[PDB]
Symmetry: C5
Subunit: 311 residues, 5 copies
């Protein structure tokens, strides 16, 4: 069992695709193992660069294929290098840009924290255990930069497992177990653009929508309700266009549905207050109580949705 020692350098993580759950990683792979004691010119390490590798493998060199289990498609391998020492050591270095995939949950959209995962595994060998994994990730930013979309929390976390494929069953003296190197980087979204542009103005719009009860006659109250509802649909479109596509309702979309509910409740209460014989036009005490209780009730249901969302 040849022991392969891996080291992954991460240069940048970007381009998260919310609907396809795929991000993009760019960096380096350095896999080092020990072979036979070859002889090299000058008794110095020999360097084989990009296209001259493929004429070294044809001669009989052993370069395994380390594939990314979770990549989508095929990584855009740029320059690759292969340095052969005299005592046997071989160091295969390559630069990759891949569009990886994971299982990400965007339900708390503006405040969510994700976990970017790379999984590495030899393509075709099972007695080639990957011996020791290291990540240098110090090139993301200075530290959780305030102009960055994703603040990365702490260093990357590595792991080496023995994945068992129970469908192969070739001879099965433990002949279907592949070593696997999993790395996870914890990231947190930057909730600043989505808090000062999409949540504050919507809070202002809803709180102003409660002012319709402050008017005087029934006709103008019910008239300006329709304008308010038009405002809300315009805002709902504004938000929908900018925000990423998703198959489920985020935190922001629930605020918009709450706005729709608030305006519909305003129309219902306006109509009811107009058509009760006790308070048709006389002694309209219902409207004052409504001004007292409508904001409190909406804030109660807002706290309910917050507590059911954070859970």
């Amino acid at each position: 069992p040849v022991d392969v020692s891996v080291s992954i350098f991460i240069n940048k993580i970007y381009g998260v695709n919310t609907l396809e759950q795929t991000y993009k990683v760019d960096g380096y792979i350095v896999a080092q193992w020990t072979g036979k004691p070859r002889k090299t010119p000058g008794d110095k390490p020999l360097i084989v660069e990009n296209t001259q590798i493929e004429r070294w493998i044809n001669n009989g060199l052993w370069v395994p294929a380390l594939e990314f289990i979770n990549v989508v498609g095929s990584p855009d391998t740029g320059n690759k290098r292969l340095m052969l020492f005299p005592d046997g050591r071989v160091i295969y270095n390559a630069r990759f840009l891949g569009s990886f995939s994971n299982d990400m949950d965007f339900r708390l959209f503006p405040f969510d924290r994700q976990q970017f995962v790379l999984e590495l595994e030899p393509f075709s060998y099972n007695n080639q255990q990957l011996r020791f994994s290291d990540i240098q990730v110090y090139t993301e930013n200075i530290d959780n930069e305030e102009i960055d979309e994703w603040w990365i929390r702490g260093k990357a976390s590595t792991h080496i497992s023995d994945i068992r494929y129970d469908h192969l069953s070739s001879v099965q003296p433990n002949q279907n177990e592949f070593s696997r190197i999993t790395v996870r980087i914890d990231a947190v979204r930057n909730p600043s653009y989505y808090l000062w542009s999409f949540i504050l103005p919507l809070g202002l719009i809803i709180a102003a929508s409660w002012s319709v009860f402050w008017l005087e006659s029934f006709s103008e109250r019910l008239q300006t309700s329709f304008t308010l509802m038009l405002t809300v649909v315009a805002y709902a479109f504004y938000t929908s266009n900018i925000l990423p596509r998703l198959p489920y309702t985020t935190v922001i979309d629930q605020m918009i549905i709450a706005g729709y509910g608030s305006i519909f409740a305003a129309i219902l209460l306006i109509i009811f207050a107009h058509h009760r014989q006790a308070n048709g036009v006389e002694d309209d005490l219902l409207i004052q109580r409504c001004r007292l209780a409508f904001p409190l009730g909406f804030l109660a249901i807002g706290c309910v949705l917050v507590i059911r969302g954070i859970t």
Copy 2:
């Protein structure tokens, strides 16, 4: 007739393109057959990896081309492997990402269920019957995940057919029949984002549009109708932008046309109630009957469109 035994692993299905009817599948192919009893170093299976295959086919190895009948373009084959046993067995393993196509019917758009289909077939041989197909699909999600866009119902369904090409007619002692492996995965859309954001608010808007009859004078009734119609066109745009493109009207678009019809009917009834000499300004009993019958009539036609849509 060499018997090829196939096994397809599905890793992820994503990126459904509604207008082009093409989805994307990523996974593995494992095709295994039996050849001549070759001799290998150490009497162990020999592994040939990516670019060293093409110098084994030139020497005289027999590796058939298994093509996907329904793919669009050419699959983005990543790592490919070829393992040659001593007793004869050959196992060709490859990783593919392809943009497949089918005949999908999105007419019940938010509640539709589709059938993702892969079709596999040897490119150039007719006496190479594909012997036995298997699918392992256990890597989609845990099970019909609530954060997934498509819930996959049950295991995949396989089939092996003998497609006849009646245009070749080379010699025709059954010399134009190709074996074919068809696999179908039943999927169901996740109708949660499209039910709490595009259908509930539109129901609220229409039900509020019926409130225009509750006003007092003709001028203000007909005035606020125009604002309502502006609201509906704004909503129709909001819906159109988010939803996928299609050549026919889904369930949601029929709700919007029903909204247009409802508001136009409201304007017609307002005008008629203003210009009948029996009920010009006197004894306006038509408006009350309208408040009684307009929502019921619209709900009747809504049930009609629902029953004609589910059929």
Copy 3:
């Protein structure tokens, strides 16, 4: 002059790009000719698959380059095959996906019928006449499917011409004439989504815009005109976003300009009726005549634009 016999299979036509006038075709080419009587193992047809062709051409085989004259870029040739019979016959089969181009006229946009054209021609030979063309197109749909964007009318129409290049003039004993295979498929757009969503609601909006004359005082008439014009600009945007880009006005855009004209005429007539001393506020017979004649005049100009559009 070697006679090449062609057969083109069409699997799917999709992705029409209105602004660039390019569509996409996916299918097969089968070109068959007769060469020298070679000797093959077993006296059976020999099959040469994808990458092993290029080491047969280097040995001295004659495989001409059949190019598509009107393709854009280079077709995404997938699997290609080459079957060599003993008596001489050679059959070159290839699978192509190309983004072809034509000269399409989208002026009657929702009701237009186009003609998809493929043009094939040997790249470098003039005494290689293409002998006989066939198209099997039976894989588009069942027949003009109701869930399809383009209904294809009838079978494909083929043609073989002798294109003359008058700029070469190499020796000119008819040494600058290339055979050419042209195929045309007649297609008709599916005018169902564009008729129940973009034309019916606009008809309703315009017909409701004529109701402004039914109000009572001048101030409110001219006030609700502005709201109507806002409605129309919102609709014009809705239509513009969904519809394809074009350098000229389709049928739908003319309806929107007619709507703009109708509302501007309404404002002009409202102002004029307010400021005529005969009918300032007294004996307003002009408004009634306007209600009689405005819809008829607009319908007349609509019939005029229809007759000038269908021509």
Copy 4:
């Protein structure tokens, strides 16, 4: 100095990218020179097609690299051909699709005329003067077609220059001068969609905005001003979405800013007319003079912007 004789065929020019200043050209290159008197089978021209060229250059053939100076990236060279005559002549023919770039000025956007430019130059030789350039461009359209986005004025204009690179200075007996072939095609945009959809409706909207002065009381005048301004912002968005992106204001955007200015001036004049003690509610002669002078003043500033734009 080998004299290379060039001939460029243009098949189609499309896909102008206003923000990146890159268009796309598709066509053919035919470069012909004279070499040594080789010997060919049958004493006839020998044709070398696509992938068999690269095994003729390795043997010692001289095929220079003719690069496009101004291309972006690398042209998508499709089929390439190379015909070797016995007396020496060599004719290299290739089909290219490239995304070229120029310095285009879109300031008069809907009425602008551009100049598509291709620049050709040997990649590495300076004593390889390009002898004679020809363009056949007769395949654009029939002539300046009315369904075309760009009407091409007249034939293409060619030029052969001696570009001097003053930074090389290798030996400098005129050892840093490269021949260059420049071709320019004059094109004119089709100002029909942008004149009947984006300019006429905006003229109507502005001319209707001047009607606000025709109302009666101050409150309703200033009220309907706000609706007008909303109309204009909606239109400004409609225009912005369809039109191409640019770093400077076109002709259309200046009309929208003029609309904003007109409505703001209307509000200022309404307020001033309400708050002058001479004409508070009495003897309102200022409003009539305003109706006389506001359209004339706006038309004056419009003529000013037109004269400063055409310059």
Copy 5:
């Protein structure tokens, strides 16, 4: 230590991607070093062009791999050339189009100035010090052209550093130090389209929004406030659609939030002025003071945001 002398030519910089922080550069690389005194035909420089290089490296030529540290993916290397002099000199010339990345701060969006950076470094050698860097950048434009999106300030600034990789530690007699060539070009955005289209109209809209206090009765004041807020949300959408995506609030977005705050404050003050018993309908001196102080207060907070933004 072979001294490599570099010279980079920049042809165009375009396509800045604000959200991914990647721009695109197109140009040439010229790296020149001195090797052994080879023998060439005719004792003249020998030119090796595109695909014939790879058969010179296989023979034993030494061509290092100069990689761009900060590129994203792999540059689209077009034509490459290699000129071998007799006395030893070798000149490797290549044409590249790459999508580079940097750390750009778009916080002052319309008035920001950026610094485009290229970083070059040998892929695999540490004793190959890069000796002397030069940039010719004279092909951007004439000078800071008024039709250009980015005005480039002054010439490019170069630098040669010794980057130390402290993780290699192979033998460490200074065996982990790579030379690096960094080049920086200072660019300034063109703030003309974003100043006459997105800032001037918004200033006009806000300044007109202050006119609501000039109306007479409470009902109409609070009514036209809602229309104003709808105007602002429409404008906020217009701006959001055109402007680039970002994870933080630019200068323009702060103006929109200020507009939201101004209109909400207007509603609050209208309501308060309606419901104070001292100035319910009598002696409404609060409204006049509000007209005096509201614009001044908003301008004060605007100056505050400007001073906190420029810092």
